[PDB]
Scaffold this active site. Structure first.
Site, PDB file in Angstrom:
ATOM      1  N   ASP A  68      -2.482  22.318  54.750  1.00 42.67           N
ATOM      2  CA  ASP A  68      -1.764  21.114  55.150  1.00 42.67           C
ATOM      3  C   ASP A  68      -2.695  20.159  55.885  1.00 42.67           C
ATOM      4  O   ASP A  68      -3.666  20.583  56.517  1.00 42.67           O
ATOM      5  CB  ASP A  68      -0.547  21.436  56.025  1.00 42.67           C
ATOM      6  CG  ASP A  68      -0.920  22.134  57.315  1.00 42.67           C
ATOM      7  OD1 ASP A  68      -1.743  23.073  57.275  1.00 42.67           O
ATOM      8  OD2 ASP A  68      -0.379  21.748  58.372  1.00 42.67           O
ATOM      9  N   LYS A 101       3.836  17.024  68.973  1.00 44.75           N
ATOM     10  CA  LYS A 101       3.643  17.078  67.529  1.00 44.75           C
ATOM     11  C   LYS A 101       4.956  16.807  66.807  1.00 44.75           C
ATOM     12  O   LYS A 101       5.004  16.037  65.835  1.00 44.75           O
ATOM     13  CB  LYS A 101       3.081  18.444  67.139  1.00 44.75           C
ATOM     14  CG  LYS A 101       3.065  18.739  65.652  1.00 44.75           C
ATOM     15  CD  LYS A 101       2.497  20.127  65.399  1.00 44.75           C
ATOM     16  CE  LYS A 101       2.256  20.382  63.922  1.00 44.75           C
ATOM     17  NZ  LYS A 101       1.697  21.740  63.678  1.00 44.75           N
ATOM     18  N   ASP A 144       4.680  18.914  54.118  1.00 48.18           N
ATOM     19  CA  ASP A 144       3.274  18.529  54.076  1.00 48.18           C
ATOM     20  C   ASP A 144       2.420  19.625  53.445  1.00 48.18           C
ATOM     21  O   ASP A 144       1.482  19.333  52.696  1.00 48.18           O
ATOM     22  CB  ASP A 144       2.779  18.205  55.486  1.00 48.18           C
ATOM     23  CG  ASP A 144       3.262  16.852  55.981  1.00 48.18           C
ATOM     24  OD1 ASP A 144       4.014  16.180  55.246  1.00 48.18           O
ATOM     25  OD2 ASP A 144       2.893  16.465  57.111  1.00 48.18           O
TER      26      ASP A 144
END
EC number: 2.7.7.6
Length: 935
Positions: free
Chosen positions: A655, A724, A861
């Site tokens: 990713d 995040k 992702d």
């Protein structure tokens, strides 16, 4: 057309399906008799009635319908002439009469071949019309079918290149095994429901438990009888409506067998959760279920299922490794090459009609079902939407009964056979039940209309990517499933994520139980998960209950059925993946991560051998189940004499962490952005989230100086992981508060952080992260402002923003202010556009991997692939990303928007579109050279 017209037309078509030609004709006659109703009547409705009469062979009735159309003043179209010809073919009418009809076709200025091509018809109908022509003097003179078109786009040009360098992967399973699996799927489709033994351990039934089971069974039988009686009464009333001439749902009820309708309503009651489901949602689900079981029935009676069997076995030969095909072809291309046997019933009923049918079914269920503590289903408004709630006594009875049988829809369970190739948006995934390209309910009709408008080749590239994702085979891992089973049976672990035994805890337990039950059912059987696309264009697995995206445990359970050897670098890739799952040394380079893996190898081996009684280092890791599965694979590889010889079923996840930010920094070519998101090659990867956290910290300290106390409340609690999550919410959103709720959930997870101000803290974090992202990235800041202001201007015009991806699939935002909502469109467009770019980059990577033969799937992702394939897939992701951004996406978007809306506020929009962000100093080619772009 008018809403009343839509339902009347649906009624006529449904009557054709039920073979109730007299009822449809009678209703048509009544409408014709009334002048106002005749105005409502449309030529297409008359044509449908004619078609049905031309499937019966009653020419006189068809002629009478023609007389009615003439009385209305409508002029017979190509479809009417078609029906006349097909009826003549069915009844072996005299050639001279057919010639007279042909002359009348030429009198209306219509070529017979052109009319047949223009108006679609069932192949039996076409054969009849052709026989009619063959009886007449005119030759059939059929034009040869055109070869299927291919995309001319440069991005897809390599995929569609005719050079024989293609090495498409072939499924390990033999052809005969694939046919048997197809037969199992076919039987499942015919039933439409799957019974799975409950995962939860069954205790020996008590005397009370047995009594509860008996009571539940008696209630179910009583409900079944009541439902049948109610259905019959409703059908009689609807038939009376047919005689009256009012629109009726009697054919819709007739299409599904009465016993099947009752069985379906009963299963819906069992499926419905204890909390309850929205009445409108339930009605829509019921209508969809009815349409599904009816398409399956129609295909079976027509014989479309047998032709499909044959056609599909031919397709299976291409997929099967043992069978050899001289020319490699893409799966949709191969299907089309064999032919197009898709049913014409794939198209659904109009949505208002579907809503009416579903509401009628739900109402019947509520009235028929009564149990002593009165009706099982209670209708209560909530936002502010009526919901159906199961009886409290019924829920208690279900718990007491502890029945081990769980029912699931055929759609809900993963397929047992490869998904049907996506030759068209409408026809994909399940062979018998049509799956529509747009999985998302919101905006599905508008998006589907856009897809039809879009050229087929552009659709074809995405369809190929989806078909490739479906073709990938998934097998549940036994070891992980066994451990999860043991914990689930006895309380489970909150840190692991196993739900505690049954406010939302009960719902989580039920969802986990269904997912585990499906996993256990398919544990020994290879299965294929079909992939469907949303409005943004992200690819998602069609089955809701069991999917890798849904849960971490599911990710651990799912591993590739097909096996590829690790190779020299595969073992290292597995170790690096394990370190990634733990989250240790994220900032440190891959070499350091590999060294750390060697250091922690003893823990890895101990955890794999004895997870429950071991050091439980995997539990410490952020993804415990995935870490455990990787540990097991690593242990097996070391146990094997050669790691390269060893075959790793488990996927290795690569990713970019922030795909959207990587796309924002590539579009603006920002040097600072490239370094932050790792687009620029660097010895050590630099974490974007850590930089955001630092900028957030400086803002937090400024706010602490200020009167506002939110920063002080959040002081020391802004962990990198929480930051995040906030960054992901800002970059990716559908303008929904749910992502903010996820940020709140992260704050709640920290016990030390006070939850009194959690809501304010989530708001403040979003603002701070947004400021940090814009400040750090100049290019991202510019692009985002431009997109927000363009979307806002388009929304003011009153048209929903529509843009075409580089792949060529048009993406539309499905937000409807009760008109487009300006808020949602302006905020939504930058995330939706970034998602579309990410999906484009993923489809390009998938197609190129398919040419190489690598097995590729995408989960958010992360891009999943075999460990040996990982290095190659990294190179592909680095080349495809550069190619995608090599094309002037910003300019293309501006031009497309100018065409769509400026030629209609538009001038201001044109100026905004013209001022595209300038390219930055950073070289695009650097992305190819960046090893750490994906890790």
């Amino acid at each position: 057309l008018s809403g009343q017209q839509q339902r009347l037309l649906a009624f006529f078509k449904c009557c054709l399906l039920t073979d109730q030609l007299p009822l449809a004709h009678h209703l048509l006659v009544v409408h014709h008799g009334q002048r106002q109703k005749r105005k409502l009547l449309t030529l297409d409705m008359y044509n449908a009635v004619m078609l049905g009469w031309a499937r019966q062979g009653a020419f006189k009735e068809l002629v009478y319908v023609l007389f009615m159309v003439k009385d209305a003043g409508l002029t017979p179209d190509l479809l009417s002439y078609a029906a006349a010809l097909q009826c003549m073919g069915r009844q072996d009418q005299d050639a001279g009469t057919i010639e007279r009809c042909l002359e009348q076709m030429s009198q209306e200025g219509l070529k017979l071949q052109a009319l047949f091509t223009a108006v679609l018809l069932s192949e039996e109908d076409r054969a009849t019309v052709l026989k009619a022509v063959h009886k007449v003097k005119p030759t059939f003179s059929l034009p040869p079918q055109l070869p299927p078109p291919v995309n001319t786009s440069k991005l897809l040009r390599d995929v569609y290149a005719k050079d024989g360098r293609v090495s498409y992967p072939k499924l390990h399973l033999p052809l005969k095994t694939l046919q048997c699996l197809f037969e199992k799927q076919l039987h499942m489709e015919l039933a439409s429901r799957v019974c799975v033994v409950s995962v939860e351990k069954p205790t020996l039934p008590s005397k009370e438990v047995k009594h509860a089971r008996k009571t539940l069974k008696t209630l179910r039988d009583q409900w079944e009888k009541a439902l049948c009686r109610a259905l019959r009464e409703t059908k009689n009333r609807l038939e009376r409506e047919v005689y009256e001439g009012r629109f009726s749902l009697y054919p819709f009820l007739c299409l599904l067998d009465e016993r099947e309708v009752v069985r379906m309503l009963l299963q819906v009651l069992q499926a419905l959760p204890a909390q309850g489901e929205s009445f409108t949602t339930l009605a829509r689900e019921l209508s969809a279920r009815t349409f599904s079981r009816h398409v399956v029935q129609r295909q079976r009676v027509s014989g479309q299922v047998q032709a499909l069997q044959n056609h599909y076995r031919k397709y299976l030969c291409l997929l099967a490794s043992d069978a050899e095909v001289p020319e490699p072809c893409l799966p949709r291309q191969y299907w089309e090459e064999l032919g197009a046997p898709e049913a014409l019933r794939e198209q659904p009923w109009p949505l208002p009609v579907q809503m009416e049918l579903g509401k009628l079914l739900a109402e019947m269920l509520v009235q028929a079902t009564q149990m002593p503590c009165v009706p099982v289903l209670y209708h209560v408004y909530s936002q502010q939407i009526g919901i159906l709630k199961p009886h409290p006594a019924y829920v208690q009875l279900l718990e007491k009964a502890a029945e081990p049988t769980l029912t699931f829809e055929a759609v809900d369970v993963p397929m047992l056979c490869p998904p049907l190739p996506w030759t068209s948006p409408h026809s994909g995934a399940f062979l018998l039940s049509p799956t529509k390209l747009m999985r998302t309910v919101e905006g599905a009709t508008q998006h589907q209309e856009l897809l039809e408008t879009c050229p087929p080749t552009a659709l074809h590239g995405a369809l190929d990517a989806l078909t490739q994702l479906g073709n990938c085979a998934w097998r549940v891992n036994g070891r992980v499933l066994d451990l999860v089973l043991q914990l689930f049976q006895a309380k489970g672990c909150p840190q692991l994520g196993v739900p505690a035994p049954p406010r939302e805890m009960h719902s989580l337990r039920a969802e986990a139980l269904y997912r585990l039950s499906l996993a256990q059912h398919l544990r020994d059987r290879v299965f294929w998960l079909p992939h469907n696309m949303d409005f943004r264009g992200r690819t998602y697995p069609c089955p809701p209950h069991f999917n890798h995206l849904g849960s971490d445990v599911a990710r651990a359970l799912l591993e590739f059925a097909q096996g590829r050897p690790l190779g020299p670098h595969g073992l290292d890739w597995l170790k690096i993946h394990l370190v990634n799952l733990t989250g240790l040394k994220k900032r440190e380079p891959l070499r350091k991560r590999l060294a750390f893996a060697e250091e922690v190898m003893d823990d890895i081996l101990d955890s794999a051998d004895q997870p429950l009684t071991g050091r439980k280092w995997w539990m410490g890791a952020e993804e415990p189940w995935q870490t455990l599965a990787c540990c097991m694979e690593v242990a097996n590889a070391v146990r094997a004499s050669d790691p390269a010889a060893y075959v790793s079923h488990l996927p290795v996840h690569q990713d970019g962490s922030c795909n959207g930010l990587q796309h924002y920094a590539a579009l603006g070519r920002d040097s600072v952005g490239a370094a932050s998101v790792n687009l620029e090659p660097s010895d050590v990867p630099q974490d974007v989230y850590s930089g955001v956290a630092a900028q957030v910290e400086v803002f937090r300290r400024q706010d602490a100086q200020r009167g506002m106390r939110v920063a002080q409340v959040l002081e020391g609690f802004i962990t990198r992981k929480v930051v995040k999550q906030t960054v992901m919410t800002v970059v990716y959103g559908v303008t929904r508060y749910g992502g903010r709720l996820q940020i709140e959930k992260r704050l709640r997870e920290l016990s030390d952080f006070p939850q009194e101000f959690v809501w304010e803290a989530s708001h403040y974090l979003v603002r701070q992260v947004f400021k940090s992202l814009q400040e750090m990235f100049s290019g991202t800041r510019a692009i985002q402002h431009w997109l927000t202001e363009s979307a806002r201007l388009i929304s003011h015009m009153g048209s929903v923003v529509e843009w075409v991806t580089p792949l060529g699939v048009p993406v539309i935002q499905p937000y409807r202010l009760d008109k487009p909502n300006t808020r949602k469109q302006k905020n939504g467009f930058p995330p939706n556009f970034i998602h579309s770019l990410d999906s484009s980059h993923m489809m390009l990577t998938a197609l190129h991997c398919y040419r190489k033969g690598l097995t590729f799937v995408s989960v958010h992702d992360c891009y999943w692939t075999h460990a040996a394939d990982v290095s190659v897939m990294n190179q592909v992701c680095r080349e495809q990303f550069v190619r995608l951004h090599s094309e002037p996406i910003l300019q293309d978007l501006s031009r497309f928007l100018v065409k769509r809306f400026c030629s209609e506020e538009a001038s201001q929009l044109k100026e905004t579109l013209q001022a595209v962000p300038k390219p930055g100093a950073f070289d695009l080619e650097q992305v190819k050279r960046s090893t750490y772009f994906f890790s």
